[PDB]
Amino acid sequence: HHHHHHGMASMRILLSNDDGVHAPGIQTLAKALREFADVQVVAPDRNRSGASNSLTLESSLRTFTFDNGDIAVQMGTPTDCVYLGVNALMRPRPDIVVSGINAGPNLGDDVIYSGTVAAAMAGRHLGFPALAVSLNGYQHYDTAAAVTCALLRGLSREPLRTGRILNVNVPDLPLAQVKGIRVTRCGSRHPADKVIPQEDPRGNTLYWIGPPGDKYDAGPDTDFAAVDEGYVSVTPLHVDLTAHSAHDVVSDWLDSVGVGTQW
Amino acid sequence: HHGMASMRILLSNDDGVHAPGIQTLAKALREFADVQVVAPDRNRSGASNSLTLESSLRTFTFDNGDIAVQMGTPTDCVYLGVNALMRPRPDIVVSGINAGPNLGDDVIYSGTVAAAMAGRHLGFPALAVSLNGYQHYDTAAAVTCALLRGLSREPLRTGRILNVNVPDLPLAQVKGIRVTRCGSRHPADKVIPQEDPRGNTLYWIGPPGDKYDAGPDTDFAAVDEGYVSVTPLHVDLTAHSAHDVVSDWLDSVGVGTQW
Numbered sequence: 001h002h003h004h005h006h007g008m009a010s011m012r013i014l015l016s017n018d019d020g021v022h023a024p025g026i027q028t029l030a031k032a033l034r035e036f037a038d039v040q041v042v043a044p045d046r047n048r049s050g051a052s053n054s055l056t057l058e059s060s061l062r063t064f065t066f067d068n069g070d071i072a073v074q075m076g077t078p079t080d081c082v083y084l085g086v087n088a089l090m091r092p093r094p095d096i097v098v099s100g101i102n103a104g105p106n107l108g109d110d111v112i113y114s115g116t117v118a119a120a121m122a123g124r125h126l127g128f129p130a131l132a133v134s135l136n137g138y139q140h141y142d143t144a145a146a147v148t149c150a151l152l153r154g155l156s157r158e159p160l161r162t163g164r165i166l167n168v169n170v171p172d173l174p175l176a177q178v179k180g181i182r183v184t185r186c187g188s189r190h191p192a193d194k195v196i197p198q199e200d201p202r203g204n205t206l207y208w209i210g211p212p213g214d215k216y217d218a219g220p221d222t223d224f225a226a227v228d229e230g231y232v233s234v235t236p237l238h239v240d241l242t243a244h245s246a247h248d249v250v251s252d253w254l255d256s257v258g259v260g261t262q263w
Numbered sequence: 264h265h266g267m268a269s270m271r272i273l274l275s276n277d278d279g280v281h282a283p284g285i286q287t288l289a290k291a292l293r294e295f296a297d298v299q300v301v302a303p304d305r306n307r308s309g310a311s312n313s314l315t316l317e318s319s320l321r322t323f324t325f326d327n328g329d330i331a332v333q334m335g336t337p338t339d340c341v342y343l344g345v346n347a348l349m350r351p352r353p354d355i356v357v358s359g360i361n362a363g364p365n366l367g368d369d370v371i372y373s374g375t376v377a378a379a380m381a382g383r384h385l386g387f388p389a390l391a392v393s394l395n396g397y398q399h400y401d402t403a404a405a406v407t408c409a410l411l412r413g414l415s416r417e418p419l420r421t422g423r424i425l426n427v428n429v430p431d432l433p434l435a436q437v438k439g440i441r442v443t444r445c446g447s448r449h450p451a452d453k454v455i456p457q458e459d460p461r462g463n464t465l466y467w468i469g470p471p472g473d474k475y476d477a478g479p480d481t482d483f484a485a486v487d488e489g490y491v492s493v494t495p496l497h498v499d500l501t502a503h504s505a506h507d508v509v510s511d512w513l514d515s516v517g518v519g520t521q522w
């Protein structure tokens with residue numbers, strides 16, 4: 001009939017985040033996805049920014065269902081949410097996990113700390129590649145929602161053959177000002193070094209973790225560079241932490257220092 | 264003592280400050296190095312690279328000088344150790360000895376690995392050390408000490424984190440070391456539901472998926488064959504091999520192009 005999307009409920013999406021179920025990023029995105037997808041939100045009960053791929057192992061998890069059908073996992077991490085949503089809670093099972101929209105970027109080596117990214121990585125085995133979506137700010141959730149809907153419509157047109165996780169960072173701009181899209185690699189930062197002390201009412205010093213370090217590798221092929229230049233950044237991710245290129249150096253080093261070998 | 268300089272180690276873990284793995288290791292390391300423990304106050308296995316951002320962190324210092332971070336994650340402990348609690352900054356982070364392995368694609372969830380990753384910008388590559396069981400902490404301590412002597416004999420030029428898994432055997436039975444890559448598992452899919460006394464269903468995370476990639480060059484295979492597995496890790500999660508396929512895909516579906 002000619003509509004922007006084919007089907008009002010053609011894809012089953014598990015939508016999660018790490019800002020928590022009440023966050024404007026996930027709620028704005030849910031409203032956009034519900035136009036064309038069958039969406040089930042399964043997200044943390046509060047802001048779990050910084051949760052990375054942490055899992056709850058020593059306790060069981062309780063869920064809470066809101067009047068609108070959204071599910072919070074109480075005390076749940078983003079990884080808990082996706083793991084339970086895929087493997088226990090959702091029927092039918094999701095075709096895809098979408099995680100976001102996060103309030104703030106997930107770029108460079110920040111990605112391994114990101115609970116937004118971790119929710120997506122917990123969906124890497126599904127029929128479509130998982131999407132992690134982060135806004136470089138707090139102002140244009142509508143832009144990030146539009147980019148996400150475009151990517152999802154793209155997946156309906158042709159399957160993506162390689163890459164199981166897409167880390168998407170959206171500039172905080174009206175859509176008409178976004179320049180385009182770049183496929184990027186993760187940049188990197190200097191080590192974060194700030195600790196912010198704050199005395200409690202009894203005079204004891206407590207410590208706040210400081211902000212990320214300055215950009216270090218923010219070259220033209222990086223996610224940083226794309227966002228900074230007004231492009232959407234798309235970086236395909238994987239979970240293999242092996243530094244493959246260090247293999248021979250490490251082997252030769254062990255031999256040279258006689259650890260593992262008698263001579 | 265012997266060299267021109269003492270090695271100054273920040274030692275952490277995620278089993279908790281009182282765990283036998285970290286205390287066994289601390290005793291061994293203090294024979295030759297200056298050791299500062301900064302570790303979670305409790306078992307935080309599965310903490311991955313999580314960071315406490317929502318609250319400030321409280322520390323406790325024990326009579327022996329060990330520092331526990333109350334509700335701190337392993338990454339929190341290393342962050343506070345490197346940036347506030349040790350002056351000057353440590354030479355190296357050593358994390359472990361973990362009670363149990365950290366192998367294959369499970370490494371991304373490991374708080375033992377995360378503490379080592381948090382030390383990746385120091386003067387020596389960080390060590391994460393995990394015992395494939397609970398008996399031979401002594402074996403894993405001896406292996407760690409050997410690596411640390413190794414790092415002071417010649418610099419390791421490439422690789423900022425070494426993930427070390429030690430078979431749970433007496434030292435005499437360990438065959439040697441293999442430099443490995445992380446193996447992988449099938450998708451984990453088991454949830455263990457248990458009702459509370461009111462009939463509400465609560466959910467436990469189940470066992471990992473069965474091994475998928477666990478052949479000859481993997482960390483799994485090394486440990487199974489009685490070798491220490493050493494895998495260099497990095498924090499760049501980019502799937503570089505997918506770049507062209509993703510770019511061509513976007514073009515083919517008209518996302519980011521008018522044509």
Ligand SMILES: Nc1ncnc2c1ncn2[C@@H]1O[C@H](CO)[C@@H](O)[C@H]1O
Pocket residue numbers: 049050051052106107110111113114115192209210211212213314316
């Ligand atoms: N000290 C820090 N180290 C790393 N990431 C930080 C820090 N402070 C804030 N963040 C950001 O918060 C996000 C939560 O994971 C991280 O992705 C990271 O970019």
Ligand SMILES: Nc1ncnc2[nH]cnc12
Pocket residue numbers: 369372451468469470471472
């Ligand atoms: N069930 C599980 N799934 C994924 N990672 C794990 N690490 C420990 N248990 C796990």
Ligand SMILES: [Mg+2]
Pocket residue numbers: 018019048049050102103116
């Ligand atoms: Mg967040």
Ligand SMILES: [Mg+2]
Pocket residue numbers: 277278307308309361362375
């Ligand atoms: Mg542990």
